[PDB]
């Protein structure tokens, strides 16, 4: 399995034409701040491809 | 690629029955088989790990034994709460910890 | 006498990702390796992922690679997995086991195992 390419799942809003993102915060999913603590809707927005 | 198979599919006997089990592989693996009792209302638990190496905390009742591509499992009584379904895993090939069908058995 | 709890159980559609966790108390959970196991409903047992007793190892089931992501906090004694992009095939009864070694591929299988928690992906109420 090769695991050196990434993509980005979460985001607070759509990208604009040509922009990159590189940031890696822990993506709120609901109302529950994450305070840089990953737990319950506090998701990790990058997953690698098998 | 290594494909598990069990043979029998259901059995039915009394309290003070003798049955067998038995679970072939497609490959040698050397004795590297788990059995696992699996309760329909609860968490599966571990009978015998490795070839017919009995897990402490069971009642030795169960015995199992067999090597390279044939197992065999009995139990020696089977009382009236040993009604369960089981399965045997294999974890010697390349592919991890594949599991066979099951066995569902009533006591009448 | 060890307890193995999870929780995360729900609904959800397909497509959105939704995180497991799973409790350990009654062993030492700083040199043991952790595994998950499925329960399809009209179907056996499934083996889904495992990491070693600390993360270098780290292996996925073939049908998931890609899709899942298996963390682990020896600090809170607890450990995690995230489900991403699911299918309808993943409406399966998902176990938290405890590996008697303390590597991912060993031949030593899975001594204790806890309740499930049943989660469905669909779209309903």
């Known amino acids: 399995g090769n695991y050196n390419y990434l993509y980005r799942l979460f985001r607070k809003s759509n990208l604009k034409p040509f922009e990159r993102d590189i940031s890696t915060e822990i993506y709120q999913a609901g109302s529950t701040p994450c305070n840089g603590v990953e737990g319950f809707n506090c998701y990790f927005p990058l997953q690698s491809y098998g | 690629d290594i494909q598990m198979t069990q043979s029998p599919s259901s059995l039915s006997a009394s309290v003070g029955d003798r049955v067998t089990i038995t679970c072939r592989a497609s490959?040698?693996?050397?004795?590297?088989l788990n059995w696992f009792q699996h309760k329909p209302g609860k968490a599966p638990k571990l009978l015998i790990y490795?070839?017919?190496s009995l897990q402490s905390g069971v009642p030795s009742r169960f015995s199992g034994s067999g090597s390279g591509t044939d197992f065999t499992l009995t139990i020696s009584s089977l009382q009236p709460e040993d009604f369960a379904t089981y399965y045997c895993?294999?974890?010697?090939?390349?592919?991890?910890?594949?599991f066979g069908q099951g066995t569902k058995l009533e006591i009448k | 006498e060890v307890q193995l709890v999870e929780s995360g159980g729900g609904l959800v559609q397909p497509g959105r990702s939704l995180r497991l966790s799973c409790a350990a108390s009654?062993?030492?959970?700083?040199?043991?390796?952790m595994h998950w196991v499925r329960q399809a409903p009209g179907k056996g047992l499934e083996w889904v992922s495992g990491?070693?007793?600390?993360?270098?190892?780290?292996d996925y089931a073939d049908s998931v690679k890609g899709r899942f992501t298996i963390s682990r906090d020896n600090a809170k004694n607890s450990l995690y997995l995230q489900m991403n992009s699911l299918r309808a095939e993943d409406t399966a009864l998902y176990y938290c086991?405890?590996?008697?070694?303390?590597?991912?591929?060993?031949?030593?299988?899975?001594?204790?195992w806890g309740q499930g928690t049943l989660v469905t992906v669909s779209s309903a109420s």
């Open positions: 009654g062993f030492t959970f700083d040199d043991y390796a």
């Open positions: 490959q040698s693996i050397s004795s590297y």
């Open positions: 895993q294999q974890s010697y090939s390349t592919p991890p910890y594949t």
């Open positions: 990491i070693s007793w600390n993360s270098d190892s780290i």
């Open positions: 490795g070839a017919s």
């Open positions: 086991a405890k590996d008697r070694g303390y590597e991912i591929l060993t031949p030593a299988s899975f001594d204790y």
